[PDB]
Structures are given as structure tokens and as C-alpha cells.
Design a protein around this ligand. Structure first.
Ligand SMILES: [Cl-]
Ligand SMILES: [Cl-]
Ligand SMILES: [Cl-]
Ligand SMILES: [Cl-]
Ligand SMILES: [K+]
Ligand SMILES: [K+]
Ligand SMILES: [K+]
Ligand SMILES: [K+]
Ligand SMILES: [K+]
Ligand SMILES: [K+]
Ligand SMILES: [K+]
Ligand SMILES: [K+]
Ligand SMILES: [K+]
Lengths: 92, 95, 95, 92
């Protein structure tokens, strides 16, 4: 029972939905490719493509500053939840 | 204005991004918007789909990376703790 | 063996990298060494020069990123504090 | 006077030298491009190329695990030293 995790999850999903909508409508990517671009951008993995429109470039700059902190907060909380069963099985 | 460290990191981040925009548009021939995009994705460690083509560009980018990552991520951290986190919390209050 | 959290993160990291090696060599057709390279650069956030071409590959990679980054960086942190830092310190002692 | 910073600097330079030597001899890159590859790898910015030899791929995997922590420790210490004059000029 972790409302902090639940809220971070919601915020992450909503942020990825917004990017998917944006890149699929403004940059003309298939939904899966718009989601992929959004994910590799906010996780800092990085893309092998870039936006073609000035609007898309500006959006991506702002999207990084809006979303990078949240995404890494979520990744951290996710890691705690995913590794804890193994830690506890190896402890008590 | 309450957190002076945040104020400094913000100004330094803006100046760093202006410097990169000027550099890449002059030396690497990018349009200013593409030079700003390149600077942002580089200093946040996202990475661009392109890379510098000139030796000057490569050397500058190495130095810009080392100095710039620390500042931009210091700014992102302060933005998260001083702006985004309080805004999220406020927006979760039932009214 | 003294730090059980480090032990768990190490094993989980190895299993995660084996899973990626198997996945990318089967679904994306990469040689195993290229699948391992891709998995490593992806989960450390370095990023590859390539990207998945199949929709299965794209979906898997999104999930692998979210689960894998946290584990691999947990491992890197533990490796730094429990192995690399004590080794550096020991190697700086005049004898 | 910061021996911690001095040591991190030395370790970083030696690590970048080793990568420059490796990628310029094994992967046939010009020195500047071997240094660039080493830097964007350890800082996690990422490269638009990859090693062509199996030896180079294996080396890069190990190089990441050997060097990423040190490089980020250095980047942090560098940031403290670079921003402190501005903070202090804005304070005392
Ligand atoms: Cl178990
Ligand atoms: Cl422009
Ligand atoms: Cl192979
Ligand atoms: Cl001053
Ligand atoms: K990338
Ligand atoms: K690329
Ligand atoms: K483009
Ligand atoms: K990239
Ligand atoms: K990165
Ligand atoms: K890359
Ligand atoms: K990257
Ligand atoms: K990159
Ligand atoms: K290659």
C-alpha cells in the first residue's frame, strides 16, 4: 500500500500519454513510435530520430524539463518495489 | 528568490544553453533552434540523433558536457524539490 | 556476501542482461554480442546507435527500460560504494 | 584545496586516456573521435556509432561499469567547484 508509488505511476502514465498524443499528431509518428520516442527521451536513453517541426523541438525541450524528474522518481520507486521481494526472500 | 542556490543554477543553466545555441549555430552550422535542441539533449544526457562534425565542435562538446551536466542536473533537482514537488502536493489537497 | 542487497542486485542485473541478450538476438535478429551490447547501453541510459525495428521489440524495450534502469543503477551504486571506493582508498595508502 | 577533487580528476583523465588509446588502436578511430566516444559513453550522452569488433564491444561494456560511477562523481565535484563562486558572490 504505497500511495506515493501510485501517484508517481499515474503521473508517469499521463506524461507518456501526452507525449504519445503529441508526437503521433504533430510529428506524424505511429502511436508505438511516439510512445517509444517519449520514453527514450524522458529516461535519457535517447532517440535515433529527432522532431522535424520547430513546434516539436520546442515541445521536446519543455517535455524533458517537465518530465525527467518525475520519470526518475518513478523508476526509483519501481525498483524498490520490484527488488524488495528478492531482498526479503534472501533475508527473512 | 527564496532559494538563492536555485536562482544561481537557473541563471547559469540559461547562460549555458545560450552559449551552446551560439556555438553550434556558428561552428556546426545548425539553425538556432537545432543548436538549442542539441545543447539541451546533450546536457540532460538524452543525447542527439546527430553529433558534431568539426574537431572544434568535438572538443567544445567534451568540455560543455563535463561542465554543463552538473549544472543542468543541479537545476533539475532544485526545480523538482522547490517547484514541482510543492505544486504536486498542493494539487493533491481535497478542497 | 556481506551486503545481501548488493548480492541480490548483482544477480538481478545478470539475469536482466541475459534476458535482454536472449530477447534481442531472437526477436530483433542481433548477434548475441550485439544484443548484450544493446541491453547494456540501454539500461545504463547511454543509448545505442540503433533501435528496435519490431513492435514487439519496441514494447519490450519500454518495459525493460523502466524495470532495468532502476536495477542496473542500484547495482552500479552498490558496486561503487562497496567495491570501487574501498579499492581506491586502499590503493592511495602509502606503504 | 580539495584532494578529493584532485584524485577524481586524475582518475577521470586516466580513464579517458585509456579509452582514447583503446578506441584509436582497436577500433581505428582518430584520437579526437576515440576521446569523444569515450566521453559520450561514460557520461551516458551516447554515441551515434558503435564498436565494430567483438573485442571493442566487450571492452565498452566493461568500460561503462568501471567508469560511469567515477565520471559522475567527478561531474558532481566539478559542479560544486564551478558554481560555488557564483553562489558566494550572490551570498557573501
Ligand atoms: Cl524466492
Ligand atoms: Cl531557428
Ligand atoms: Cl555473438
Ligand atoms: Cl560576481
Ligand atoms: K540514444
Ligand atoms: K543515433
Ligand atoms: K529530424
Ligand atoms: K541519441
Ligand atoms: K543518459
Ligand atoms: K546513442
Ligand atoms: K543517452
Ligand atoms: K546519443
Ligand atoms: K558498429
Amino acid at each position: 500500500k504505497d500511495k506515493e508509488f501510485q501517484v508517481l505511476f499515474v503521473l508517469t502514465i499521463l506524461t507518456l500519454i501526452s507525449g504519445t498524443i503529441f508526437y503521433s499528431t504533430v510529428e506524424g509518428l505511429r502511436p508505438i513510435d511516439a510512445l517509444y520516442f517519449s520514453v527514450v527521451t524522458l529516461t535519457t536513453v535517447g532517440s535515433d530520430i529527432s522532431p522535424q517541426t520547430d513546434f516539436g523541438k520546442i515541445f521536446t525541450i519543455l517535455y524533458i524539463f517537465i518530465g525527467i524528474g518525475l520519470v526518475f522518481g518513478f523508476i526509483h520507486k519501481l525498483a524498490v518495489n520490484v527488488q524488495l521481494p528478492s531482498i526479503l526472500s534472501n533475508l527473512v
